[PDB]
Design a protein around this nucleic acid. Structure first.
Ligand SMILES: [Cl-]
Ligand SMILES: [Cl-]
Ligand SMILES: [Mg+2]
Ligand SMILES: [Mg+2]
Ligand SMILES: [Mg+2]
Ligand SMILES: [Mg+2]
Ligand SMILES: [Mg+2]
Ligand SMILES: [Mg+2]
Ligand SMILES: [Mg+2]
Ligand SMILES: [Mg+2]
Ligand SMILES: [Mg+2]
Ligand SMILES: [Mg+2]
Ligand SMILES: [Mg+2]
Ligand SMILES: [Mg+2]
Ligand SMILES: [Mg+2]
Ligand SMILES: [Mg+2]
Ligand SMILES: [Mg+2]
Ligand SMILES: [Mg+2]
Ligand SMILES: [Mg+2]
Ligand SMILES: [Mg+2]
Ligand SMILES: [Mg+2]
Ligand SMILES: [Mg+2]
Ligand SMILES: [Mg+2]
Ligand SMILES: [Mg+2]
Ligand SMILES: [Mg+2]
Ligand SMILES: [Mg+2]
Ligand SMILES: [Mg+2]
Ligand SMILES: [Mg+2]
Ligand SMILES: [Mg+2]
Ligand SMILES: [Mg+2]
Ligand SMILES: [Zn+2]
Lengths: 159, 102, 204, 55
RNA sequence: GUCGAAUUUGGGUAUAGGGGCGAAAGACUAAUCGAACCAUCUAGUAGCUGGUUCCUGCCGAAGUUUCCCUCAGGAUAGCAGAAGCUCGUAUCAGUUUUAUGAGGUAAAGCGAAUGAUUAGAGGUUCCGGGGUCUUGACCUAUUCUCAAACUUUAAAUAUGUAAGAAGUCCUUGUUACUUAAUUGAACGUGGACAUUUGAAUGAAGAGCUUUUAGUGGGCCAUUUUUGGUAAGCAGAACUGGCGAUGCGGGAUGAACCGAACGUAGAGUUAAGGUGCCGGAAUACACGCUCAUCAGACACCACAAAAGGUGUUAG
RNA sequence: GUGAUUUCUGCCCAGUGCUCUGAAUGUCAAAGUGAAGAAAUUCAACCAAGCGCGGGUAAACGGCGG
RNA sequence: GAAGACAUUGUCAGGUGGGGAGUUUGGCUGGGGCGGCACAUCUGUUAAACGAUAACGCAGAUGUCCUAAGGGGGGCUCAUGGAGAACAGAAAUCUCCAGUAGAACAAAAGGGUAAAAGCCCCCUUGAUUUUGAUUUUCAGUGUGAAUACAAACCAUGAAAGUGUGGCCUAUCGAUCCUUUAGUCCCUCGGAAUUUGAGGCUAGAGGUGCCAGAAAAGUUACCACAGGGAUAACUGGCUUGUGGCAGUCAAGCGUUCAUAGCGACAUUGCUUUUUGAUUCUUCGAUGUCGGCUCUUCCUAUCAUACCGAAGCAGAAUUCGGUAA
RNA sequence: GGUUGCGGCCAUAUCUACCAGAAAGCACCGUUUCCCGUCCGAUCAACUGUAGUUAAGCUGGUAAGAGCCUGACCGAGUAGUGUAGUGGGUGACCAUACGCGAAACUCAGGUGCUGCAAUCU
């Protein structure tokens, strides 16, 4: 018959990295998590307690609870035709801070500095990101850069 | 499996409310009274003509029974029940395993 | 009792090698892969001729054995026993299955061995002297009739079985950078300890 | 008489007729599953600050 | 066949339905017998077969999930209709971009681990066996070839989160939690910053509730893919279709190509075509081919290995 | 049950049935008897046939290997 | 005359009782049956790098085992190889060196682990009490298993800490009924006491067809509702198998590959074999062979005309045009 | 800059073979009454800093070193792959169009950085 155990099909997902087995470095335990922080889930194979289920591998959530050696994370899971809210109790070895907003908070700080700086001089502070634009006109010189002619090569085997 | 005849565990006897010494024995069912309401109803239904009126189980599948231990507090005589996993051989005596010899 | 080769010509299944899950597998029909003067030095046989596959298919171990005998017999008779070094460049590691008598429980039993070859993959290689080019070419040509699909005969520009062009091999040899060890050679690198690279290649 | 065993054909198309609803977000999410020791003190903290603003 | 008897036969009489009668065939018991006929219970029950009566308008499916002595049936969720309700620039999206995660398949690798595997060469023994020197064993440096249940490395396509007012910053209130400690945690008072207010595009507006129909036999095509010699065979993955669909094209065809349909007129096209049937150039241009079984257009209604001083080009 | 006459009908009683002027302290109903209890009731002893044990039986059912 | 409180008859009780009555006598399934369990589950793979994903796909496993093989702490380091030591040798015990785990960790497999999760030693029962939340299968029901806390009581350690069974991924069970533990609480409805009975909370006795009816055969005497959702004929797809035909040429043929043959290999054709499949027909297409009669195919046995030979003649052999 | 205690990242830090090391520190080293632990004061415990030594540990340097790390229009826009056609081919497969894009290989460079406290020609 078929087999659908809790850790089914996790042969490679829960392995350690190459030449990265052994004990967990101490910086994992020294990090501080607060309610509202955004974290991403990646299970560690050497810690069998507080281990997430394989579905939540690679998912990102928000902390809602803090305990002694673990935190509570909220995950939106799509079941059928709608998303359902999932709550996970994970030890700190299996999570880390998500950098998906640490580079966004600095833009918030930059916007405020730029808005205040131009307040005294110029209107239209222009604090919106823009996609890559088409290139402008330019002049290419041939001084020391005379074009070199290329032609297709004949067929050879060289085996 | 082997289980010691004595055990130190919690006792909710309203006087201990703490870990005490307990004697350990093996639970046995006990004889079924013929004046229990379920028995009185069954005997009435069986009388007269019509034959057997209730199912009689036949397709036995289990080979073992779960062991239940009765724990009596030595202080207040309060009892408690614990259920262990299924096993084919159970004993309450001593004869602990020896670490290593011939 | 053996099915026609057309039943197992194409690579329709994943590789199914002998292993601890297969176990009971019959032996391959071809056991010898090096023929002729296999002890000859690299300098003796500069010319190399290849029989190159031109299709993505499977070659049975029976076909490899039959082609090996045909090629070796002709070259030996015309050129001589020690005038070439013939090497089979494909090994049959794929186990074929056959279902023997409806379709209930149809998983088959091992039937034979075959080699899965790609487009442009070398099948046979022969090294010999330059004067023997015609003989070895005719020997490889006669071996094509034993194989399904299309094969091409290509005159290699490498020196013998080495991965170097003829001018490159000559330049290394005159500089004392080539040392003989059996039928192949060893080269000198600019890396490693001087203590090891001096005792070897003293001429350089 | 054997029949079909399983397939997911047409199931995504059914899901996209009305479904794939992004979950709605509420201010003040429920405190279910939060540490009970935190909740006991936070209840007293809320009661005390009520009197400060009321008075 | 038998024909003087265990013979043939009229009439009278006896045995009645789970009963009779049987030199025995489950035979016979009023054309009815492996349980007669008649009326009633009785319009017996049926997950099974058949049928089910006027028009127009709008919307419009499912053969999938879980459970069931469930497998020709139900319950349950989904898909559908109807009734609306709260509001209305509002947040949203089968999409992209930017920032930041997750993966172990394609490929690749084996003088990298594990497991297979060809060939020599140089060494090693009071530690294999013959012979006074070989063959096996391991050692070291090389060499050929491999892996759905091997691997250091490792894509493409898919996939999680974020891109602000429920935001950011400054000041300081509550608590029985926490700290050596007004330390921190959580929730707040007051103050400062408006919609180039924090990427792109779009948005027959968004959000929400009740109720109920049918369905729960599917099948086909491209790509990925398992069993099988193979099948118009059996079984999965994503998408698009048929079923439920006419119309132009493929002579003909449920699924292919084009395109989806209120009633008409005019114009222009798609796929496919323009010797005649047949609407439209027996148009233009450069070559190739002669076949005593030429050839002629995707799905598609078949042809191979191997050959020819036929002819053409290289 | 076998199926005129003639001739002949062998061996097996472990199994399944049938049968016995066999055995005794196995198993055992209601009633009755004894004990305990304030009673409902509980417990124990005794205990018919049958079964079990023992013997007979194949022109009873049937069997007649390595 | 016989017989006698015994037979007899009446009411309960035990045995016997297919003579008779009623009923039952799983499912999946390349038809059904037999076999197997793909029926409740676990590991790896098939699975196409989130998750999900089928077949009677591939290789295996589960209905157990453990007072330690559970919990805490300490000390220690394994497999193997090399060099040595009376008896002693390939393997006994002792010493050193090298040793990333090539060992070990109850079991199937995959993960995980080195001053440990392995080995040895010491101390222990947290494998405990109360009731909630969460994850997996999922309808976001149950059951099983698992995760993180709160409130108690404990174990261990100098301590930080760790511990709510087994390093992780499987090792199991509703209603009704019976029984036990707890609370000694609620009720027996005219009012009380005492037995008995009935409730409240938590376990055990089991349903393996594992969301859980109590169940033997036969029909060749047979019946009904249906089914081409499904087997026993043709026809269709396929051609393994059967049959027929090529290519290559090691050899056979006194010499000589190919007059006539031809190994090891390899490419096809046919539907006059048999399988595979289940599309058409179960409100029916009459089912083996022979007899009779017509026509068609050529892969030609004979007849006509030819080529070739190891064709002197005769006879025969190979091939062509030809039904 | 040297050294010690406690660390962070966890080989640019490891491994092999050699050489060097002032001052201080660390270490080896001396002893067995006491607490304590062993077959053995070797390990562990205690006492002295006295009797000795940089021999080793430790630190640094050296090697066309092994390993590891980084980069490269080195290989290679190759393998593979998303999307498209009434494209080629009997088939097996392949070419082209709009996109994404490896690994091995080759070569070059590199061989720990750093936080808190204390101390030293
Ligand atoms: Cl479908
Ligand atoms: Cl009558
Ligand atoms: Mg009765
Ligand atoms: Mg097979
Ligand atoms: Mg179905
Ligand atoms: Mg009969
Ligand atoms: Mg009649
Ligand atoms: Mg009716
Ligand atoms: Mg519509
Ligand atoms: Mg029907
Ligand atoms: Mg995988
Ligand atoms: Mg591959
Ligand atoms: Mg139906
Ligand atoms: Mg229909
Ligand atoms: Mg056509
Ligand atoms: Mg016309
Ligand atoms: Mg007689
Ligand atoms: Mg009577
Ligand atoms: Mg009966
Ligand atoms: Mg069935
Ligand atoms: Mg997946
Ligand atoms: Mg353990
Ligand atoms: Mg555990
Ligand atoms: Mg079930
Ligand atoms: Mg059919
Ligand atoms: Mg054949
Ligand atoms: Mg079908
Ligand atoms: Mg007819
Ligand atoms: Mg008819
Ligand atoms: Mg198209
Ligand atoms: Zn007590």
């Amino acid at each position: 018959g078929k087999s659908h155990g809790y850790r089914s099909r996790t042969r490679y997902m829960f392995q350690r990295d190459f030449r990265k087995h052994g004990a967990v470095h101490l910086s994992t335990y020294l990090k501080v998590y607060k309610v509202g922080d955004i974290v991403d889930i990646k299970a560690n194979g050497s810690i069998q307690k507080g281990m997430p289920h394989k579905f939540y591998q690679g998912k990102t959530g928000v902390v809602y609870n803090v305990t002694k050696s673990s935190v509570g994370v909220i995950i939106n899971k799509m079941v059928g035709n709608r998303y359902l809210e999932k709550r996970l109790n994970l030890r700190v070895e299996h999570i880390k801070h998500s950098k998906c907003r640490q580079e966004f908070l600095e833009r918030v700080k930059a916007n405020a500095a730029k808005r205040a700086e131009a307040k005294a001089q110029g209107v239209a502070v222009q604090l919106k990101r823009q996609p890559a634009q088409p290139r402008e006109s330019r002049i290419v010189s041939t001084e020391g850069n005379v074009p070199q002619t290329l032609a297709p090569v004949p067929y050879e085997t060289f085996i | 499996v082997n289980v010691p005849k004595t055990r130190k565990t919690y006792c909710k006897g309203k006087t201990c409310r703490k870990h005490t010494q307990h004697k350990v024995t093996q639970y046995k069912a006990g004889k079924a009274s013929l004046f229990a309401q379920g028995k009185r109803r069954y005997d009435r239904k069986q009388s007269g003509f019509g034959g057997q009126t209730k199912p009689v189980f036949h397709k036995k599948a289990k080979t073992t029974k779960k062991v239940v231990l009765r724990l009596e507090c030595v202080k207040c005589k309060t009892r408690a029940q614990l259920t262990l996993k299924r096993c084919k051989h159970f004993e309450l005596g001593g004869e602990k395993k020896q670490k290593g010899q011939a | 009792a053996r099915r026609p080769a057309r039943c197992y010509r194409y690579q329709k299944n994943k590789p199914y090698p002998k292993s601890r899950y297969n176990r009971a597998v019959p032996d391959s029909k071809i056991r010898i892969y090096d023929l002729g003067k296999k002890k000859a030095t690299v300098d003796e046989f500069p010319l190399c001729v290849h029989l190159v596959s031109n299709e993505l298919e499977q070659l049975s171990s029976e076909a490899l054995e039959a082609a090996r005998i045909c090629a070796n017999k002709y070259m030996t008779t015309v050129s001589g026993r020690d005038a070439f070094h013939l090497r089979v460049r494909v090994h049959p590691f794929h186990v074929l299955r056959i279902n023997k008598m409806g379709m209930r429980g149809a998983w088959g039993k091992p039937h034979g061995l075959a080699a899965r070859v790609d487009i442009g993959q070398i099948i046979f290689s022969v090294r010999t002297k330059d004067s023997n080019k015609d003989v070895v070419v005719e020997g490889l040509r006669r071996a094509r009739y034993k194989f399904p699909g299309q094969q091409k005969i290509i005159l290699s520009k490498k020196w013998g079985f080495t991965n170097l062009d003829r001018p490159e091999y000559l330049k290394k040899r005159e500089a004392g950078e080539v040392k003989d060890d059996g039928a192949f050679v060893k080269f000198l690198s600019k890396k490693g300890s001087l203590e090891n690279n001096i005792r070897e290649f003293p001429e350089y | 008489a054997k029949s079909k065993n399983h397939t997911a054909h047409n199931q995504t198309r059914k899901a996209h007729r009305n479904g794939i609803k992004k979950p709605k977000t509420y201010k003040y999410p429920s405190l279910k599953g939060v540490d009970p020791k935190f909740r006991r003190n936070h209840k007293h903290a809320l009661h005390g600050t009520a009197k400060a603003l009321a008075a």
